[PDB]
Swiss-Prot record:
Protein name: BRCA1-associated RING domain protein 1
Record text on subunit structure and interactions: Homo- and heterodimer. Heterodimer (RING-type zinc finger) with BRCA1. Heterodimer (via ANK repeats and BRCT domains) with CSTF1/CSTF-50. Component of the BRCA1-A complex, at least composed of the BRCA1, BARD1, UIMC1/RAP80, ABRAXAS1, BRCC3/BRCC36, BABAM2 and BABAM1/NBA1. Interacts with UBXN1.
Start and end residues of each BRCT domain: 1-88, 102-203
Known function: E3 ubiquitin-protein ligase. The BRCA1-BARD1 heterodimer specifically mediates the formation of 'Lys-6'-linked polyubiquitin chains and coordinates a diverse range of cellular pathways such as DNA damage repair, ubiquitination and transcriptional regulation to maintain genomic stability. Plays a central role in the control of the cell cycle in response to DNA damage. Acts by mediating ubiquitin E3 ligase activity that is required for its tumor suppressor function. Also forms a heterodimer with CSTF1/CSTF-50 to modulate mRNA processing and RNAP II stability by inhibiting pre-mRNA 3' cleavage.
Localisation: Nucleus
PTM: Processed during apoptosis. The homodimer is more susceptible to proteolytic cleavage than the BARD1/BRCA1 heterodimer.
Effect ascribed to mutating V130L: In a breast cancer sample; somatic mutation
Lineage of origin: Eukaryota, Metazoa, Chordata, Craniata, Vertebrata
Residues included from the entire protein: 566 to 775 of 777
Protein species of origin: Homo sapiens (Human)
Length: 203
């Protein structure tokens, strides 16, 4: 049997947030305001999925990512309603079936060096996401000592990305030869897009 649900809201209204907490006590579960691996459900306000850290952490966690009409229906009925109808399609579903099937994490076998400055999605956010996605953080800019001898494969790679698993992530002007050796150059937008689609996208 399942543990009690652990819910969280992302980009929710103030009313929607009151409504959500009213469900938690009714469904006899916790509601959180900060994301944790124990979170079962992430509720978004609309239908589009949000590029917030919580929604992203939830996708990598294989959580239900559901429209707010789910909470409405739950309060309306005072039951846990079945989630699929409210699930946000594409990446979140993909990720949840990956979790349910015990398949490896999105960035499994991959390594990431975060180069330069990050405004849009800060650096600490990126670190959290590489770690939540089963990826590893390179503390040094990859050149050719450890670089060739890294011999992992990436499950979610289609592709040279299967076995060239190291990434220099940038936001700033990075002129270039997208791959040199086992190391790719990729903008953070590519990384974010991977997470939102639950996909190791081609470069």
């Amino acid at each position: 049997r399942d543990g009690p649900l652990v819910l969280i809201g992302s980009g929710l209204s103030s009313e929607q947030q009151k409504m959500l907490s009213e469900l938690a006590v009714i469904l006899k579960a916790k509601k959180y305001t900060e994301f944790d691996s124990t979170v079962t459900h992430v509720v978004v306000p609309g239908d589009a999925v949000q590029s917030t850290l919580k929604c992203m952490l939830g996708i990598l966690n294989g959580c239900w990512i559901l429209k707010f009409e789910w909470v409405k229906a739950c309060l309306r009925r005072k039951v846990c309603e079945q989630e699929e109808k409210y699930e946000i399609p594409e990446g979140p579903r993909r990720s949840r079936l990956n979790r349910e099937q015990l398949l490896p994490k999105l960035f499994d076998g991959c390594y990431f060096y975060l180069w330069g400055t990050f405004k849009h999605h800060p650096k600490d956010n990126l670190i959290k996401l590489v770690t939540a996605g089963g990826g590893q953080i390179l503390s040094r800019k990859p050149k050719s000592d450890v670089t060739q001898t890294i011999n992992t494969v990436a499950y979610h790679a289609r592709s040279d990305q299967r076995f060239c698993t190291q990434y220099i992530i940038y936001e700033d002007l990075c002129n270039y030869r997208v791959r040199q050796g086992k190391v790719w150059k990729a903008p953070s937008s590519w990384f974010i897009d991977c997470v939102m689609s639950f996909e190791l996208l081609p470069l």
